[PDB]
Amino acid sequence: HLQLPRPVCEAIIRPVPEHRADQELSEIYRDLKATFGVPWVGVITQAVAYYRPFFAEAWRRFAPSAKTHFFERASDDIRIRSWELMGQSFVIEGQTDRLREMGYSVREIGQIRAVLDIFDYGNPKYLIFATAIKEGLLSGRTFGGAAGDARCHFPRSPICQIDPIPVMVEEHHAGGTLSQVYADIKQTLQLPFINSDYKAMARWPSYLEQAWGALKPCIDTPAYQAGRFDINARALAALDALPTAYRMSRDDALQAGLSEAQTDELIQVISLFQWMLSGIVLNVTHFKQQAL
Amino acid sequence: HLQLPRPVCEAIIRPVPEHRADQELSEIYRDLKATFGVPWVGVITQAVAYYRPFFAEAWRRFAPSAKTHFFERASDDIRIRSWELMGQSFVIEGQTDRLREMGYSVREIGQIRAVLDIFDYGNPKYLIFATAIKEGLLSGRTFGGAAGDARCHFPRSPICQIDPIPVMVEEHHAGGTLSQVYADIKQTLQLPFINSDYKAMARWPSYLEQAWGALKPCIDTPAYQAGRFDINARALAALDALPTAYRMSRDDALQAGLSEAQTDELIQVISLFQWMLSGIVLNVTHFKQQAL
Amino acid sequence: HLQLPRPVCEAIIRPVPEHRADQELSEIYRDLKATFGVPWVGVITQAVAYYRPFFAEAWRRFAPSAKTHFFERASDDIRIRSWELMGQSFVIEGQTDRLREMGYSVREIGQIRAVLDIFDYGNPKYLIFATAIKEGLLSGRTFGGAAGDARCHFPRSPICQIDPIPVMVEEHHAGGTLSQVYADIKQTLQLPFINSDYKAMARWPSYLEQAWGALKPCIDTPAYQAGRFDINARALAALDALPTAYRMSRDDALQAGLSEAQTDELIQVISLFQWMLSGIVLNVTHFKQQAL
Amino acid sequence: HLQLPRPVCEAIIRPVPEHRADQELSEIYRDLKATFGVPWVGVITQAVAYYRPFFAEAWRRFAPSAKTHFFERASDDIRIRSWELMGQSFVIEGQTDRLREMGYSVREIGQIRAVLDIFDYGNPKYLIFATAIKEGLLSGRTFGGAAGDARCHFPRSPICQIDPIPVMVEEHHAGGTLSQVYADIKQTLQLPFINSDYKAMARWPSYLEQAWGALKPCIDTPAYQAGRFDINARALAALDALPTAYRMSRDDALQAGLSEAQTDELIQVISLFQWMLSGIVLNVTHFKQQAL
């Protein structure tokens, strides 16, 4: 009965997407993408972006760890675990053939796998970042900092795809039918937003409904909820193990320039996204397992 | 009341899309795109591609002209005329303010214009090609070939975007309301196919539904049907003025490897697509005037 | 025996290249590239950009004309004339067989032509811009702006290559012998700088060694000097026919924030690049006819 | 005083570069790049590619292992080991200060690092592949295949740079000084060819002049020599642990269609490249530490 609570969330989330970002924000957005080695700024960071002096300083405190061999391996090990959990817990009778029947060519199915690959690789990095932000605020604690194995502090595996931004069907791009797929997900996952993951799948409307439609019955089953706690506890372990110490408390929030009250709302906001992220990692894993 | 007849189109169309093309075909596809200087193979040429040795040979007979200063200016003057025609015959309200209110940012509206630019540039080039193919078959005639102004034989203005293929929501990609928006168009336009320019617009569903919604009432008004005659007449004039003579008769079809039967079917296919291309040139013009 | 008088420029040129440009200036560079529809910022515009508030202002005033059918055709008509001129004045030996025998493959020779095309397309546009800036300052006149044919004000031929920036071997990149070919070019062309064109061709040092060596004997022959004057005059004529009036005189330069002392230097600097731009249009034409 | 014996190479090496590779071979070249996740076909694979039916068959059999977490981790640990090794064996002064003073902007130095990054990531993967071909042929043995940890069989970390092909100044591109730096490199490393990485560094000839000059004294110091053997041993150990069994014996090479004469020749060619990739791994590690 291992299970992860969806927090209270009073808070209005105010993402700054990349197509609206001003030049100052877009610089941090670029540093973020380059450092992780991902071609998309996640909604979580679009949302912490609203509290921009916090985001700026938090990222600055976190960026050194993100650049390390340790952080590459820690994220990669969360992807592997998800691949392990979902393969053991759920039946994946594939869908390459289902897609062929629908009309999809081998080229197209390639392009889809390539999109799911991006998020497969990128989400454990956002999860760990989310975790550090939320736990730093909540506990005021200093995390990581140990020397240990010197190879842990080495530069991460260096190749990366950072351009272009994946094609994403935003919520105001959406027509009616797709809007209902988008409402169906928000409700099912209990989120006020559509993940970048689904939006990029949505470029292929008929493909997204098929995939989501196979994933939906697995959400909040006990094995899913167990698996999600597991993924969550591993991001908590990566937080404890950062190569460069990370502290960003409520008081560092004030010093960064936020009111006490804005810090309270930020905590609700990051707690929501942090809870979202262990779930999307199972979610993306599922889509990718079907795709093979 | 000048009108140009929608022909009979008994014939099944069988386009080989780029994501399906094999190595041999993809190579002619690359030469096509490179010469015209467009990043997409048009449905017209996808469809004539089914009759591959005719398509191969016809393209060979036409490409010398396509590479010329003459052909660049003839295509460009067709765009200019359509801009001229639609600007006068139609009151087209600006509508970027609507898009803004729907939630589209200044950057997104930019990307949308960039897509319309592609087709605004490329469709006169496909229109003239489809005209050469059609009339060569019907009349057996040898068109152009005059020396004239030596500058007409000069290399065309050199710059092109060749990549990537635009993002198109193909018909099997399409979801619910979009399959009915696609249906709406097929019917209104009397076509069995959805054009590439709509599919590219389809990446922004909400933007398609009401760009199209604004254009639909214009189709087959007298000023529309007349503007279309004008565009069709000008492609016939560019056909007569080709700097390298083009002949591809019915008997060349047979020589190419086609049967009498297949050639009969090809004539129906090219006539339908040829008819389509003057309509789509006004259509794209309309979209693009809306988007100022 | 006709020729373009080389101006005297004692003035130091201080180009801001794209790889040192700050955010604000990159934003203007970007807009310049998107409107011209070329992938590179000219050394001409890099040197004017030093006197930044004047550059910013000459560009806002000129850009309305740059976006027009008139400006696209006028620039393109200068490319045609240079092709005509060099073709009739010079017997140019083909060099692709000699490239082949040096080791160059078909694709490579193709890459070489593609780069040449970029400058064959772009440079007349810079020539006209430079002419406008120079004459506006020398004469104080308002140029163009007559109503005339409505089509001249239409949007220009709409698709372009903006990315990536051409691979250019800068002077501080060059090793010994490439620094000697750069020295040669400078003295023969009478310039204190290396054009973007040669640096781009310099990606293939041996090809540049060849194409420059075949061009050089033709430099400042009578047929060159007369053709150059004619190219020049075409730019001056392009100036009087601009769709949207352009005035940027000394009084305007002062108002933009320049001193008296900086305006005299700017007049010198633009004067030297203006003279230059007639020569580079012919030079790449020779290049490009060598490579047929 | 440990050292890797250089093998006698009598054989003429005959690489098909990406810019000459035909359609069939380019499609093998593609798959190799999309599996390794690098944007370049290595010269080792270019030379084995001459023996094309053997090349196709050795890659079909090795590709199952290359697609695995094991292979990703194992290649990555070779990168980690060389960093560790050159770091504790050598005190390497920074060079970015001299690059600055030479004229290199912050972005250019950034670009150079990004190119170094590529090889830093890819080369271990080419080391291991080359090791499998050499040992397979020399010993007739089946390599890897034991079940072990299930995770080893999982899909590798799923993101890559596959385009564009790095800018590489080939030997028929090079001019005067470059040819002599290339000459220096060949004799110093005892190779009758230039590696992809020096030709890439060569886009910036003065950078290559500087980075190679700082390396060359270190070449064949005891420390270098001893470290190179270690890297070589770990490749040999990666070979015994391949997730999916690999056999490609001389007998196998006969079935693929090689004579006995070509197989002797192929054994000499792969042997010389096999020896070489242990060195290039240390070599670029050095450049990269020079450039921190």
Curated annotation (Swiss-Prot), chains A, B, C, D:
The entry's keywords: Hydrolase
Pfam families: DehI (PF10778)
Superkingdom in the source lineage: Bacteria
EC number of the protein: 3.8.1.9
GO MF annotation terms: (R)-2-haloacid dehalogenase activity
Catalytic activities: an (R)-2-haloacid + H2O = a (2S)-2-hydroxycarboxylate + a halide anion + H(+)
First-level EC class: hydrolase
The keyword Hydrolase appears for this protein: yes
Family statement drawn from the similarity comment of this UniProt entry: Belongs to the HAD-like hydrolase superfamily. S-2-haloalkanoic acid dehalogenase family.
Complex and partners: Homotetramer.
Function: Catalyzes the hydrolytic dehalogenation of small (R)-2-haloalkanoic acids to yield the corresponding (S)-2-hydroxyalkanoic acids.
Designated name of the protein: (R)-2-haloacid dehalogenase
Protein's organism: Pseudomonas putida (Arthrobacter siderocapsulatus)
Gene: hadD
